[PDB]
Design a binder for these strands. Structure first.
Ligand SMILES: [Mg+2]
Ligand SMILES: [Mg+2]
Ligand SMILES: [Mg+2]
Ligand SMILES: [Mg+2]
Ligand SMILES: [Mg+2]
Ligand SMILES: [Mg+2]
Ligand SMILES: [Mg+2]
Ligand SMILES: [Mg+2]
Ligand SMILES: [Mg+2]
Ligand SMILES: [Mg+2]
Ligand SMILES: [Mg+2]
Ligand SMILES: [Mg+2]
Ligand SMILES: [Mg+2]
Lengths: 104, 54, 131, 88, 95
RNA sequence: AAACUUGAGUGCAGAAGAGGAAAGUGGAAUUCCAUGUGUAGCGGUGAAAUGCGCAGAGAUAUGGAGGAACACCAGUGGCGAAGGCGACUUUCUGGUCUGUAACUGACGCUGAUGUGCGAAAGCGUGGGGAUCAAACAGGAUUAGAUACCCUGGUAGUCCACGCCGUAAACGAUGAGUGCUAAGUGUUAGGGGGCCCCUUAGUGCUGCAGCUAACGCAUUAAGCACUCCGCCUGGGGAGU
RNA sequence: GGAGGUGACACAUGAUAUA
RNA sequence: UACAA
C-alpha cells in the first residue's frame, strides 16, 4: 500500500510524501493517526434537490433500480472544498486535502 | 567509425530495390549516422559503385 | 547585463515568497547583507546565513510563513533605481502601508528603516519598501 | 583564416609574460592577423557578405580592447600601436 | 598537411600494355610539387552500376596523396578532363 | 587609488552544421533536332473548340544540343542577425556549441545620429533562353466575361556587374541580465553507473502568475533592473 | 480524441427611418 | 406604420 504511480506522471507536490515512486510508509503511519458508484453532481451542494430524490427513493421500479445503485472524485472535493481526510496518491493533489494520507 | 563510400556492400543495405536511400525511421539508424550514410551513397553513385535508379 | 543587484535580491525574495519556498540563496554584497539583517530584525524573514566562497560570498535567507501558511512578506518594491535615484529628507520620510510596512533607507549612519531615520533625524536614499 | 602554428608565433611575440594568452596585447595582435587574413579573402571574394560580417565583429572587438588598453596604461598602448600597422 | 584519396576509372577496351603508360604517368602527375604518393592501388574490372560513355566496366584506380598545396591534384583533374582514357574521377580530402 | 574573478574576452581539448564566396563533376526529367519502326489521330475540357497531324503527327527506340533545377535522403531536423541556405568535389572563409580553468582582470549592456546587409517584383549594361509565364492573340463560358478554363506566347524567370531598399521582411512578440512547479519528444555534446545526472538548441503539454478574452507559461505574454524604437479615436492619409 | 506539417456547366439583384 | 418609386 506504498507503491505509487509511475514517475512520468507523479505530481511535484508529493515529493515529501515520495522506476516508479514508493510512498512514505513511515510518514503515513504518523498521518493515519491524525486522520462505489458514480458521484452525482451536486450531491452535497444541491441537497435541496437530491434529498427529494432521496425521499422519493424511500417512497417506479425502473427509477428505483438506478436510484438504489446511485443513492476520480474531483466532483466531490469541489462540493466540499467550496464548503470550507482521504488517501492521496502521488498523482493526486495534496494541497486540497485537510487530512492527507500519503499511502498508495 | 566513419562510413566509406568504397564499401558498397555496407551501403547496399541502406538503399531500396529502386536504388533510393532508405529513410532512417525504416532502417533504425541514428540521425548523425544517416547523414554520413547519405554522403557516402551519393559519393558512391558518382563513382558508379552504386546505381542512381535501377 | 545585471544592472541592479539590489532589485535582483528583492525580486528573488518576491519570487521565492510567491511559491512559498523555505529558503533561497543569492550572491552576497555588503548592502544585501545589511538589507537582509533588517528584514530579520523587523520580523519579515526568519534567518540570514553568510556562506564564504572564493568569488563574492553567498547569502542564505529563510522565509517566514504564519499560521495557515500565510506569507509574512506581502510585497517588495524597489524605490531608488539606477535610471532614477530617489532621495528623501528626515522631514519627508515616507511611511509604508500607514506604518504597517517599512522603508529601507541608506543614510550616512548606515542602512536603517524609515521609523529609525526619523528618530535619528537623517535622510538618504530610499532603497525599497517592504510590507 | 590563420593556423594554430601562426597563432602561437604571434602569442609568443606579444605576450607580456610567460604563460600569458589573455592580455590585450596578445588578443589585439592575434585579432590583427585574423583581420588582415579575412581582408585578403575578401579581396577576391567581394560578394562574401557573411564572412565580412565576422570581420566587422573582429574589428569591433579589437577596437574595444585597444580602448581598454589605452585608458589603463597609455605607454603599453602606444608601444603596441607602432608594433602592428595600426593607427589609433 | 593534407591527405587526398584520388580515384579514377579507365575505359575497359584499352590495350593492356598501354594502361601502364598512363597509370605510371597519372601517378607521376599526382606526385609533382611536393606530393609524395602515400599509396597506389589497382582495382580490377568492375561492373559499373550504370553505363558511362556507353561503357559497362572500368579499371578502378586509387591513389593516396600527401601534399600541402593541392596544385598536384589540380593538375590531375585538369589532365583527366581532356583525356579520353579516363572516364570518371573524384578527389577526396581524407583528412 | 588598490585588490578580485563570478560578467566579458583569450588559450587549450573535442564536436556538429542546406552558414557564405569561387571553380569543377554528375544522374533523372522538360523542350528542340536527327534517324529507324510504324499509322490515323494526338492534345485538351464540365462539355468543347482553338492548335498540331497523312508533306507521316502523337507513340516507340537510339543519338545529339541546350538551359534550368537537384527525386530518394528529408525529420515542429540542421545552419544563419535577418533576408535566407538542400546533388556531389575541391579551394578560400564566418559563426555557434561542449569540456577545461592557462591567461587578462569589468575590458560589459544598449544604442539617437551613422554605416551596412536585405525575399520577390522592377531598372541599366551585357550574355543566355530549356521550362514556366504578366502583357498579348486565338478558343471557350456568360445577359455581358477586358476573368476564372483551354491552345499559344513576349518581358521576365537564369548568369555577371551596378541600382532599387520594399513585403502578412510574422513568433504580427526589440536587445541584455537574473529569478520562478512539473511531464514528455527531438538535435549537438559532456559526466557516471541501456539507464541516471548535466550543458546548449528545438517542439508539445501543463502549475503559480499574468490576460479583456483568446491564450502565454524556464524558448513568458510571469516576477524584476538597464538601454533603444514606437502609440495616443476613425476617415482625410502614409495623402 | 485533440493539435501542428503534407498532399487533394451555370446561380445577378433586392430603396429610408422605424423592428 | 410613415415614407420613397
Ligand atoms: Mg577547437
Ligand atoms: Mg560548433
Ligand atoms: Mg549593441
Ligand atoms: Mg537607427
Ligand atoms: Mg529578381
Ligand atoms: Mg495561359
Ligand atoms: Mg534581366
Ligand atoms: Mg544582383
Ligand atoms: Mg510592425
Ligand atoms: Mg525581454
Ligand atoms: Mg527573461
Ligand atoms: Mg501552455
Ligand atoms: Mg529546453
Amino acid at each position: 500500500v506504498h507503491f505509487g504511480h509511475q514517475t512520468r506522471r507523479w505530481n511535484p507536490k508529493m515529493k515529501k510524501y515520495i522506476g516508479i515512486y514508493i510512498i512514505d510508509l513511515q510518514k503515513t503511519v504518523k498521518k493515519v493517526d491524525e486522520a462505489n458508484q458514480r458521484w452525482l453532481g451536486g450531491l452535497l451542494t444541491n441537497y435541496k434537490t437530491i434529498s427529494k430524490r432521496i425521499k422519493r427513493i424511500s417512497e417506479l421500479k425502473k427509477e428505483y433500480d438506478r436510484l438504489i445503485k446511485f443513492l476520480k472524485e474531483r466532483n466531490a472535493i469541489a462540493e466540499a472544498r467550496k464548503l470550507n481526510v482521504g488517501i492521496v496518491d502521488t498523482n493526486c493533489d495534496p494541497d486540497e486535502i485537510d487530512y492527507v494520507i500519503p499511502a498508495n | 567509425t566513419h562510413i566509406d563510400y568504397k564499401d558498397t556492400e555496407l551501403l547496399k543495405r541502406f538503399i531500396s530495390e529502386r536504388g533510393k536511400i532508405l529513410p532512417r525511421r525504416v532502417t533504425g539508424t541514428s540521425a548523425k549516422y544517416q547523414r554520413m550514410l547519405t554522403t557516402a551513397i551519393k559519393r558512391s553513385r558518382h563513382m558508379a559503385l552504386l546505381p542512381y535508379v535501377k | 547585463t545585471m544592472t541592479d543587484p539590489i532589485a535582483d535580491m528583492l525580486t528573488r525574495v518576491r519570487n521565492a515568497n510567491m511559491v512559498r519556498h523555505e529558503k533561497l540563496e543569492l550572491p552576497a554584497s555588503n548592502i544585501k547583507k545589511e538589507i537582509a539583517e533588517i528584514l530579520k530584525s523587523e520580523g519579515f524573514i526568519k534567518n540570514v546565513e553568510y556562506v564564504e566562497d572564493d568569488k563574492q560570498g553567498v547569502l542564505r535567507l529563510f522565509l517566514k510563513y504564519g499560521q495557515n501558511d500565510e506569507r509574512v512578506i506581502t510585497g517588495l518594491k524597489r524605490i531608488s533605481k539606477p535610471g532614477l535615484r530617489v532621495y528623501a529628507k528626515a522631514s519627508e520620510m515616507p511611511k509604508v502601508l500607514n506604518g504597517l510596512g517599512i522603508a529601507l533607507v541608506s543614510t550616512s549612519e548606515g542602512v536603517i528603516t524609515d521609523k529609525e531615520a526619523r528618530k535619528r533625524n537623517v535622510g538618504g536614499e530610499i532603497i525599497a519598501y517592504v510590507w | 583564416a590563420i593556423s594554430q602554428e601562426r597563432k602561437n608565433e604571434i602569442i609568443k611575440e606579444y605576450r607580456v609574460h610567460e604563460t600569458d594568452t589573455g592580455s590585450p596585447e596578445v588578443q589585439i595582435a592575434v585579432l590583427t592577423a585574423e583581420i588582415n587574413a579575412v581582408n585578403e579573402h575578401l579581396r577576391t571574394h567581394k560578394k562574401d557578405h557573411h564572412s565580412r560580417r565576422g570581420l566587422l565583429k573582429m574589428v569591433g572587438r579589437r577596437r574595444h580592447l585597444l580602448n581598454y588598453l589605452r585608458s589603463k596604461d597609455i605607454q603599453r598602448y602606444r608601444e603596441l600601436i607602432k608594433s602592428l600597422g595600426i593607427r589609433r | 598537411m593534407r591527405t587526398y584519396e584520388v580515384m579514377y576509372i579507365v575505359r575497359p577496351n584499352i590495350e593492356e600494355d598501354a594502361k601502364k603508360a598512363l597509370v605510371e604517368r597519372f601517378n607521376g602527375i599526382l606526385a609533382t610539387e611536393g606530393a609524395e604518393v602515400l599509396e597506389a592501388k589497382d582495382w580490377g574490372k568492375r561492373r559499373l552500376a550504370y553505363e558511362i560513355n556507353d561503357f559497362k566496366d572500368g579499371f578502378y584506380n586509387i591513389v593516396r596523396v600527401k601534399s600541402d598545396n593541392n596544385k598536384a591534384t589540380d593538375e590531375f583533374q585538369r589532365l583527366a578532363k581532356i583525356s579520353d582514357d579516363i572516364i570518371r574521377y573524384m578527389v577526396i580530402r581524407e583528412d
